[PDB]
């Protein structure tokens, strides 16, 4: 916007959005292992 604090947040948030997908994939694979046992 016009604030540097605004820019840092935006960067963190595009990254959280990306982490969320991997975390969900990690969880699926891990769920499958427990069920196989």
């Amino acid at each position: 916007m016009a604030d540097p604090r605004d820019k840092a947040l935006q960067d963190y948030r595009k990254k959280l959005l990306e982490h969320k997908e991997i975390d969900g994939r990690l969880k699926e694979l891990r769920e499958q292992l427990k069920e196989l046992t």
Partner: protein, 47 residues
């Protein structure tokens, strides 16, 4: 890291902020490698 908290950004000056964002980007590469690792354990188990 300290991402997803407003309070940290206000508290830290710009020098840290440029540095921090750069570390956070490299983090995605290591999480992709982790997905690939679980798939192997599962293959061993499968036999």
């Amino acid at each position: 890291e300290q991402d997803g908290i407003g309070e940290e950004v206000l508290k830290m000056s710009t020098e840290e902020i440029v540095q921090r964002t750069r570390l956070l980007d490299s983090e995605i590469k290591i999480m992709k490698s982790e997905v690939l690792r679980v798939t192997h354990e599962l293959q061993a188990m499968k036999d």
